[PDB]
Symmetry: C2
Subunit: 581 residues, 2 copies
Amino acid sequence: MDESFIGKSGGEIFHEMMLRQGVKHIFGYPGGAILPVFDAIYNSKHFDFILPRHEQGAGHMAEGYARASGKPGVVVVTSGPGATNVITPMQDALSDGTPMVVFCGQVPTAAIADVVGISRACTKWNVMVKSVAELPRRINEAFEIATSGRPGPVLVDLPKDVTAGILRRAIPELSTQQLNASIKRAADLINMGKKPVIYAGQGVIQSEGGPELLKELADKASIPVTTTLHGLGAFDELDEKSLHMLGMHGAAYANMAMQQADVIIALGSRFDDRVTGVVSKFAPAARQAAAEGRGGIIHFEIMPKNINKVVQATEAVEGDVGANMKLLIPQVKAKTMEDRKEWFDAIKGWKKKYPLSHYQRTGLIKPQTVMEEISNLTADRKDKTYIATGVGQHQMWVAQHFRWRHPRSMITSGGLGTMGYGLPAAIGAKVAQPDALVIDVDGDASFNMTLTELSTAAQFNIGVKVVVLNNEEQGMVTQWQNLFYEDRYSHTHQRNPDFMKLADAMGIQHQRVAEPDKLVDALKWLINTDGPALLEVVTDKKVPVLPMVPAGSALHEFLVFDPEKDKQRRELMKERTKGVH
Amino acid sequence: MDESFIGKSGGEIFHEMMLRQGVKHIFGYPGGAILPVFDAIYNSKHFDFILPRHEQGAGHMAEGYARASGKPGVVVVTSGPGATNVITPMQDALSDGTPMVVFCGQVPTADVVGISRACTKWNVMVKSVAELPRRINEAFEIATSGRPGPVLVDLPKDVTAGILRRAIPTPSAATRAAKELSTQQLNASIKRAADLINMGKKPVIYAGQGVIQSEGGPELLKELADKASIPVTTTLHGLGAFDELDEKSLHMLGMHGAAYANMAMQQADVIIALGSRFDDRVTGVVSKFAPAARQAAAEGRGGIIHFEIMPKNINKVVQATEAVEGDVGANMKLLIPQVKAKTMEDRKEWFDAIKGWKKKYPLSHYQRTGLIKPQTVMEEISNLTADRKDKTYIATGVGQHQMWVAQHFRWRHPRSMITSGGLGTMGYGLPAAIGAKVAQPDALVIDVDGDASFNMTLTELSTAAQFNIGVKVVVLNNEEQGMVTQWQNLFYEDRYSHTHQRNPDFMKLADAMGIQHQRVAEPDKLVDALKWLINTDGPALLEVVTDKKVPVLPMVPAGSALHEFLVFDPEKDKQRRELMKERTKGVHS
Ligand SMILES: Cc1cc2nc3c(=O)[nH]c(=O)nc-3n(C[C@H](O)[C@H](O)[C@H](O)COP(=O)(O)OP(=O)(O)OC[C@H]3O[C@@H](n4cnc5c(N)ncnc54)[C@H](O)[C@@H]3O)c2cc1C
Ligand SMILES: Cc1cc2nc3c(=O)[nH]c(=O)nc-3n(C[C@H](O)[C@H](O)[C@H](O)COP(=O)(O)OP(=O)(O)OC[C@H]3O[C@@H](n4cnc5c(N)ncnc54)[C@H](O)[C@@H]3O)c2cc1C
Ligand SMILES: Cc1ncc(Cn2c(C)c(CCOP(=O)(O)OP(=O)(O)O)sc2=O)c(N)n1
Ligand SMILES: Cc1ncc(Cn2c(C)c(CCOP(=O)(O)OP(=O)(O)O)sc2=O)c(N)n1
Ligand SMILES: [Mg+2]
Ligand SMILES: [Mg+2]
């Protein structure tokens, strides 16, 4: 029975609970209904408060802070438009399993925007706090739900009269057996397999000790490892067993491995549609091996309702992937590269047949090169380097041509795919990792969505580095329009603002590079700059992201780059567009 | 039976439905789920398409288009984040009754219709190509009828990529008897309303956005007020429904309304509420609202007459002595012949009390040094547009500047006020102005914007530049969230928690965006800068550096009754600034 809250207001109690929860940073924006909380946190020493230009920036900043730190991002906003503005961040956090706690002012309880109802389908949980006494309880509930199981966003409603009111009174197995049985069935299934593969996702990064255990099992039994977009960095991409990223824009060899493997080991990962291609043509070899009782698909998942949602698991290992790997690594029998000479020989053949470094290459900077060079210039510091991206081609290229070695280095919007996520998430990651190098690799359209937040980085002296790729197009959509609609480019081009005058207007140091010789010096300038800075890279237009497995394709039915296709495509487009492209 | 669509994709059907609906402009942003619609409208000649920087911008531009033109704003976005980014404009449109049809791409059959159910007037997911024309027509009909509002239409990719291969489809006595009976009830309630007015000795008209949204509404309002010599006050959204230069104008009422409007409302024996919903920021403390009118109802000599199109909305906030259901313009046509004419001389007592209040509490009485006063910016914009009020549209952000333009611009033209009132979304003004300018290409459209409001959506300046949409922007630069610092002064003893921001350089920003620009800080140069802005061609921005910590007055604070307002007092203002300077140790003067 607690009594250290009598005589304090709900805002003052809320201030105490942030301390008890270890909240060191809060992102938010005031308004009428949330004003009692802003009075309580006035000139606080418990945490730093970041005031953005827009609540959507507050929301994405909290996401990047969580992605970089594994701590929950915390947001405080007012009722009405304050809350509706954080819906895209919340839905985004929900889609990508990012822990977030969002507090909203509400009108007084007596007087009934339906913030709670509007947000049911876009949060992991939400609650309206109906009395000042409930306040420590709900706040604790909210923080644990947001971080338990699959982490997610939680919305807490703060009625003004609750936060302004004053507290007067004092306020308050045999499944394990079947788990071990499932672990044993999986080890048998791994050992039995001759063509195994690890398919690792963000669940590994979000489990304590996860990447290390990933390394162990993959080393001991010499199993090749591929990851999703969110799994990037859960395994050293320089390791010889690395297959890199699979899926819609994965490496053609990672796609080959998955399509021909007979034992697939799914760690984290929810088998998203941008990973599997058409699901009835996905993992044929592992599916036959399931039917021939000689292999299949193993799926380590912490959420019961996520299992067999998309693909049927041969054996399902329910619970924390890190803990369950500690009971599976024993029961797996070691192997060597020599053991799987035949398997790795096909893998290594695929790597030479389809290298990620085989893309058209002078005069106009190539966007893949920018990612190669950012990778090169930071190779000596990848344990202290974080990348935030927008959404589009640039997002895929940096997945492809950047070598991920550090877990949580990839800060990107995957499930929802929110353009504009990049810059705010970078700002939040750099608040989380002040002594790290945080780069926002951004396409100009994604960047045009939220570029008002440069002012947040200037006002607070947050040293993010921004690379804007300037191709004057919605690149990902032009690709699709070239592919499926014969170069009819419908509303996919924008006039950019002068990014150099813009960075100047915002109080951000800046340079612009357009000549491929000077590209590396420019990038070197950006990294070694002190305080926030922006580099504008003028790139080539109409550059496809390959490999791509398009809509309706199996996963092995990917397209890849051939210089005769690239010559032919651009000249068909030059004629269709009548010289404009 | 309609065969014209055989062989058409869902996208091409959509394209044709826009033509049949007479849509002339669409605001949107492509994505994967919606690509078949974009392929079908590629280089269309039937409407202009505005690509914004952010889908929130597309929505607010559609709002401003609708607000300036009375036509629905049409939005087209993709699934997931394309759809969640328009939730703020949709909730905004719902709260303010703005007709809007939002088309969202959807993956083949975010939870767009789940997350948007509570923030739309109606939503529908089209399930097959065959039903697309029927649903399109349903959406426009719902969006524009009754109280207008936003309607969300989910468009699954299989519906818009799919092909239609087949044709599709295009009064009793009991009904007739019931029809006559309901007409007689309406006519009865109109007579009673008329009788109530005729016995009133201190009548007042309380006019809202419903009058602007009704065909003939402002004309009929003027005829009524003229014939019976009734003074007219309006809400924030009703500004421009009545000529504020007429001797019968009480200007805006409510939390920041003219003191003479709030007095008149509190003394009136008959209140004629026309197309208004008695919002809490209008009535003050409801139980203390309109005491004179409530007493006159008790004694059978007056009360509150409410003209309202949504029958359900009557008696939800204030008890009506006489309700008149339906479209306020149609019912005023029937009301006016039954109201007996009165001269201003017949109402000498009433207008003399009002002239008293107007003399005692003039809106022009505010602190008037070397820093530009924000109130004075508004008065000068009103003076400088004296000859073109019929072609001038004002969009605003949310905050003090929004109250000041409501108070000191003299409103004369229906739909000239374009502002977010119900939800109160900061960032509305600039996109809404762009939308209004698209709707009225030959009108003067001005975005009067606070700096924090402007900072939310300033990226949309690139939209005005790319499409050469000549909006005029006035940014009031006080470096504060002025409305919140007024609340923090009032209730939290000058504890200014997180309500100050460093702006960007607005001249460098405007230049970066390709917008001609100017900055003004000296009171002697304000008029010429405003003259410069108003006479430019193409988009233009004027930054006005203003005084700080200026309270909006008059003010009915929370928990006070409508007649319990605070007014400007030069000595109280001096004490306030003195105490603020002490507590902030000279930081805020
Ligand atoms: C334009 C675009 C292109 C894309 N291209 C690709 C592509 O080519 N390839 C690709 O892979 N992705 C791609 N993505 C991203 C893709 O859509 C998904 O967001 C992503 O693949 C899913 O990542 P994940 O399954 O690893 O992690 P999540 O989606 O976060 O799910 C991880 C799973 O692990 C579980 N989990 C979490 N914590 C634990 C724990 N401690 N123990 C056990 N389980 C746990 C969760 O419940 C969840 O089911 C693209 C996105 C966009 C917008
Ligand atoms: C900080 C702030 C301060 C504010 N201060 C004030 C203030 O001092 N004073 C003020 O007035 N507002 C103020 N507002 C705005 C206020 O919150 C409301 O948005 C506004 O008062 C509502 O105006 P309305 O009733 O005219 O319009 P609406 O909210 O649109 O209501 C119109 C009503 O008319 C009905 N209607 C529509 N069409 C018709 C028709 N054809 N026939 C009949 N009925 C119809 C609708 O159903 C509805 O009931 C403020 C807002 C903010 C954010
Ligand atoms: C908020 C929002 N709106 C629309 C989309 C649809 N969309 C769009 C318009 C893409 C093109 C991104 O353009 P960019 O300039 O940011 O990057 P690239 O040129 O590298 O593709 S990618 C994509 O998914 C989206 N993901 N998010
Ligand atoms: C999107 C959003 N966030 C927060 C608020 C809360 N709020 C805030 C923060 C106001 C201050 C706006 O400051 P401004 O610079 O735009 O204008 P003034 O300085 O003239 O008040 S007014 C108001 O209602 C809001 N209405 N909308
Ligand atoms: Mg681009
Ligand atoms: Mg301001």
